[PDB]
Amino acid sequence: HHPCCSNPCQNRGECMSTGFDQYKCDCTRTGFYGENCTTPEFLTRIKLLLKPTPNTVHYILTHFKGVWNIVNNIPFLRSLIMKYVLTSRSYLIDSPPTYNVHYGYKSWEAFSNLSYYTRALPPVADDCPTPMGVKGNKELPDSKEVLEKVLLRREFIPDPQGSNMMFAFFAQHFTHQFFKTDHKRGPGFTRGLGHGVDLNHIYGETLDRQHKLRLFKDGKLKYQVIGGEVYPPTVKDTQVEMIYPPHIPENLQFAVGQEVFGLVPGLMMYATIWLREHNRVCDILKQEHPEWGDEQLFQTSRLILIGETIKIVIEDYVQHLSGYHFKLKFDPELLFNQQFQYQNRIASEFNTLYHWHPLLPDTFNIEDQEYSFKQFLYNNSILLEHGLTQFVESFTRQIAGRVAGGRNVPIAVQAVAKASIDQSREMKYQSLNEYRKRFSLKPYTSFEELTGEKEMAAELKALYSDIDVMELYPALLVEKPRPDAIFGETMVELGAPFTLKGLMGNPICSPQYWKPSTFGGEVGFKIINTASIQSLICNNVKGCPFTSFNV
Amino acid sequence: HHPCCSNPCQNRGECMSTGFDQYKCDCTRTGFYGENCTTPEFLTRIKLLLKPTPNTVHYILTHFKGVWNIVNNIPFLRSLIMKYVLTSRSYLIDSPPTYNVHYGYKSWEAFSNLSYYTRALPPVADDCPTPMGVKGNKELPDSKEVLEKVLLRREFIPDPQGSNMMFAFFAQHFTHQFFKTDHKRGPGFTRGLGHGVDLNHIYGETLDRQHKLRLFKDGKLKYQVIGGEVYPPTVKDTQVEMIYPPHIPENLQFAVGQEVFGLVPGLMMYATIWLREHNRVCDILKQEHPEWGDEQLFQTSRLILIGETIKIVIEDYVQHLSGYHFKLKFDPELLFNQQFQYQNRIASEFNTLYHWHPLLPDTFNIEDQEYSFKQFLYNNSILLEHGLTQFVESFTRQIAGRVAGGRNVPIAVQAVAKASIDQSREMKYQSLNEYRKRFSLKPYTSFEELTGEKEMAAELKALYSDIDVMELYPALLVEKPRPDAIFGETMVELGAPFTLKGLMGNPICSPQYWKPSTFGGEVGFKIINTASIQSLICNNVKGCPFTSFNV
Ligand code: COH
Ligand code: COH
Ligand SMILES: */O=C(/[C])[N][C]1[C](O[C]2[C]([C][O])O[C](*)[C]([N]C([C])=O)[C]2[O])O[C]([C][O])[C](O[C]2O[C]([C][O])[C]([O])[C]([O])[C]2[O])[C]1[O]
Ligand SMILES: *[C@@H]1O[C@H](CO)[C@@H](O[C@@H]2O[C@H](CO)[C@@H](O)[C@H](O)[C@H]2NC(C)=O)[C@H](O)[C@H]1NC(C)=O
Ligand SMILES: *[C@@H]1O[C@H](CO)[C@@H](O[C@@H]2O[C@H](CO)[C@@H](O)[C@H](O)[C@H]2NC(C)=O)[C@H](O)[C@H]1NC(C)=O
Ligand SMILES: CCCCCCCCO[C@@H]1O[C@H](CO)[C@@H](O)[C@H](O)[C@H]1O
Ligand SMILES: *[C@@H]1O[C@H](CO)[C@@H](O)[C@H](O)[C@H]1NC(C)=O
Ligand SMILES: *[C@@H]1O[C@H](CO)[C@@H](O)[C@H](O)[C@H]1NC(C)=O
Ligand SMILES: *[C@@H]1O[C@H](CO)[C@@H](O)[C@H](O)[C@H]1NC(C)=O
Ligand SMILES: C[C@H](COCCO)OCO
Ligand SMILES: C[C@H](COCCO)OCO
């Protein structure tokens, strides 16, 4: 078998076979040397001694509220700290990207072919004696058994951070522009060839689809008016393909950028909000530029919405998730004197870690109704019936489920959770502890350490035998959460670098794009730099209801 | 008409219309302010004071040969200066890219759509009152008159820098992997979606084509043996489509990565040399790695050949063109502590400036034969008749034509030269002086200043009337050359940033790729770092004839 099966190279050293039974570690620029890249250089020694752990930094960022209140109001300091946040997270991501599901070594194919998700760790080689390389049993435990024993919800566990359904559906809507797995090809393939925040879930992945969605007057997107309210146009009207069961009535077959967004009225809520926002920004730009044509209105509005999206994701969405007292800032200028690559390739593991199934409630509570999954799925009539204002008011008040801490996956989506496990295995993912090392975390030394409790840990112990072959995805959902938090350490330490890299990597953050003229002048630039989840709702939903990502 | 038609914003300020008759300039980070971005900040004043002209720096780099001999032998010093060369040129190229033929403003469409060449300057708006904006006559002069008066060769003018046919065919072969105009869409579109040095002209642009060219044993490319010599395989054998006239026999339809390389036996010469090189590197890698399969052998060989190509282009090809006594260095590590974007998008103007028609001789002289263009075109029998060794010996000794200085386009390709002019106009290129300003050069203030002589200048004056509406492409070919040089200032000052960006922007130059393990270990890595045009020929051409890019 492949001599690198055991993953012998540490500290980001790269493993290469040098014969049938021999390997060589390439320790270049790792800060370590020796056979397995485990002997630290002197400066590396010092650095390691001084480095606080991720849990320590998390403690600091979530305490001393008085101090952060001062820091937050000293722009120089706020900028200083945010600069540090951006730069330290980014170093963990290979950019230009490297591996993918078919290439455990760098290749022009893996670099150039955008149909692949990229990989933060190379796959376990096909001929390794065990699924995780050399450790563990010949087969991993039955995925249904892992699912039933430690993932399925017994009783709803609410998020102690107060995340609500506005949050849950924003997470789903936002991330499905770049997690678009191409199941015709396989789980390691994506249909999202822009690999980031291009808002294809609003505008369409292809030019053909975009043009069917556009009005070609005033830069705007097509729409329909039902009971005096603006909604996306129909499939019949646009000839845009959408996934809908055959029985859905014509006028409820809403057509939007992302073909799966008819699946859940919570997605169509945001689809409708962002469609209205696009047209609103068209109106503003036309006021500023009576001389502009439809094409420039459309394109400039799209760039503005991309900026608004990134703004909201950082200052509302990530802000909420982080639990930090420090106020995060979206400010491309902070990187202009830093080394940083304005590009991004979506990693398969980023997709996997974002399978936040436990967020989903047992029922969807709108106004005085409590809809089951069966009632809610593919049912845009609920959106029409209640209207956006009531959707916002209701989802803002409904709490979502805790993601870490175990046993909180709703049985309604059990097949999705099992598939997350099965697909990780098909894609030959390395173990939890290999991923922890890859992101500079200490490997767990026991199952009890992983979960922080005894019952689930004993079940995992009997299932997996060795903590070093525990899998990434189930581990994320059973991990001991941070104190009163929605996530554990692994989720945050992998998720944050992928996220900040996907946001800041966008060309609109680069110096030649980040200027008022890109956005039609100071008026457009201001729309981006003042964007918030509250103003998005206030501008586009009748009655300007209060909203936020916490109950 | 568009109020930015006059190109009012200077110093890279960005022009935006603000009503039908008004514009505003965005002076962000230009170092200037004021209505047209012409008022310098104080720092800017200081910089412009201590900034030597490109002609001054050229003088320094092409004199004091004894001093440069010292410098070239002090690795620290050589590195410092090469680092400066790389970084100063870099800043002139927008990366991530901005405009294209259809977008004179930034847009997601121009950013994301790889089928376009990008644009260093936006196109002149469709409704401008003159072709160059507002200056000049309502129509540009007849392109036939420009061609006949100042571009067509009377007597052959040899390159005083001594460039030979090995050089001219290397230029064509190398650049045609990323200048691949998609004529069914238009001159502003490319089929080269890799936008750089990906060696698609050897391996094919698509996976389907690559797989048809590959042997699938030992990592190798398919080949044929004729009279004991290795050549590319046939169209019949591979089912690879190639462009050939109907009268070419089956056995002479060589199939290579780039569909057009059957056009010219000098291109097939290099195609054969590089195919041999790939298979040679496969043999070396297999010796190092008896455990590797075909796929990894093939992929790793490709990365090595990409590295070899960049190495040769910098240290032999650009070295020769430059005329510098300073010894240029291919060393990705020079950029690792610098701000630099590892990506590239091919500019239309980079394609246009590379239409080095005047390089071509009146006849192609191999052994004791002198082939006409009609005899030479599409005639791979010439290659088989003389063999590669004789091709190399002959083309190494045949001098090429001077590109700048005027009246040196061979009549055989007059239609190609006229097309360069016409297609620049179709793509609505701004004027020579706009491009000069765009690349920090002083606008020419007369036709005489442009040409350095009186006769062609007075022709051009009669044709164009105003030096500020002189066109870029014909100006490159008539420009006053540097002393005894192949090119004038404009060609170099535009071509060098585009070139160094296209070379260093490659992912193999990034720190996660530039490691021996990427290239199968220290032996594979050393192939890149010791590559040269001479070694490429020595290893792959019977007899190891001497070669270089000068006669
Ligand atoms: C982030 C939060 C989130 C939420 C709230 C959510 C809510 C819901 C929901 C009802 C509200 C339903 C019925 C589903 C059901 C599904 N989800 Co999610 N999903 C979420 C994150 C994801 C991600 C990430 C993917 C994978 C994307 C890909 O590759 O297509 C996904 C994929 C799926 C798939 C495709 C299965 C596959 O193998 O790719 C189904 C089915 N789902 N999910
Ligand atoms: C750099 C030197 C160079 C040389 C030596 C050279 C040598 C020769 C040669 C005989 C040896 C012949 C018969 C031609 C003839 C042609 N050249 Co060149 N070409 C060169 C650089 C280019 C470039 C660059 C293009 C545009 C490429 C595109 O968009 O495909 C080009 C395009 C062409 C075209 C198509 C026109 C177009 O609009 O693309 C023809 C025909 N030609 N050339
Ligand atoms: O789509 C999949 C999973 N496989 C395709 C393959 O797809 C390529 C993927 C995976 O290799 O990588 C990225 C490539 N994208 C680009 C832009 O290069 C994809 O093309 O493409 C192969 C070749 O096109 C397909 O294999 C073909 O081979 C046979 C011909 O000998 C056919 O009979 C096959 O059915 C198929 O057409 C492969 O299916
Ligand atoms: C490099 O890593 C290998 C593991 O892949 C080390 O070999 C192991 O060493 C431990 C402790 O010394 C033993 O318990 C194992 O039995 C060894 N396994 C194998 C497969 O050899 C090796 O010692 C490391 N090299 C260095 C210099 O530390
Ligand atoms: C890149 O842009 C080109 C030019 O707009 C696109 O080509 C057009 O595609 C539409 C359908 O989407 C066709 O109807 C036109 O015939 C095409 N025009 C030309 C000039 O070729 C191309 O689709 C775009 N590429 C992507 C990936 O969107
Ligand atoms: C919705 C949960 C259905 C579980 C069906 C499979 C039961 C196997 O799971 C068992 O469930 C018990 C009850 O929570 C636990 O006490 C055990 O630790 C667990 O192993
Ligand atoms: C869809 O929602 C409506 C309420 O708008 C509800 O009455 C209906 O039963 C739902 N449909 C299904 C199939 O559950
Ligand atoms: C700016 O340039 C325009 C040319 O369009 C010129 O008319 C005007 O005087 C300039 N303004 C200043 C302040 O120099
Ligand atoms: C092709 O080249 C051969 C020499 O190899 C020459 O004899 C022949 O005439 C050429 N063909 C044409 C059409 O000129
Ligand atoms: C999962 C990740 C957590 O970030 C929180 C701290 O940055 O954010 C969402 O993408
Ligand atoms: C035209 C340009 C000149 O380069 C010389 C660098 O000093 O090179 C093209 O690759």
Swiss-Prot record, chains A, B:
Residues binding substrate, per UniProt: 89, 324
Membrane-topology descriptor: Peripheral membrane protein
Active site positions, chain numbering: 176, 354
Cysteine-cysteine disulfides: 4-15, 5-128, 9-25, 27-37, 538-544
Annotated keywords: Acetylation, Dioxygenase, Disulfide bond, Endoplasmic reticulum, Fatty acid biosynthesis, Fatty acid metabolism, Glycoprotein, Heme, Iron, Lipid biosynthesis, Lipid metabolism, Membrane, Metal-binding, Microsome, Nucleus, Oxidoreductase, Peroxidase, Prostaglandin biosynthesis, Prostaglandin metabolism, S-nitrosylation, Signal
Catalytic activity: (5Z,8Z,11Z,14Z)-eicosatetraenoate + AH2 + 2 O2 = prostaglandin H2 + A + H2O; (5Z,8Z,11Z,14Z)-eicosatetraenoate + 2 O2 = prostaglandin G2; prostaglandin G2 + AH2 = prostaglandin H2 + A + H2O; (5Z,8Z,11Z,14Z,17Z)-eicosapentaenoate + 2 O2 = prostaglandin G3
Effect of residue 548 to A: Decreases acetylation by SPHK1
Modified residues (O-acetylserine): 548
Role, per record: Dual cyclooxygenase and peroxidase in the biosynthesis pathway of prostanoids, a class of C20 oxylipins mainly derived from arachidonate, with a particular role in the inflammatory response. The cyclooxygenase activity oxygenates arachidonate (AA, C20:4(n-6)) to the hydroperoxy endoperoxide prostaglandin G2 (PGG2), and the peroxidase activity reduces PGG2 to the hydroxy endoperoxide PGH2, the precursor of all 2-series prostaglandins and thromboxanes.
Protein name in UniProt: Prostaglandin G/H synthase 2
Organism name: Mus musculus
Lineage of the organism: Eukaryota, Metazoa, Chordata, Craniata, Vertebrata
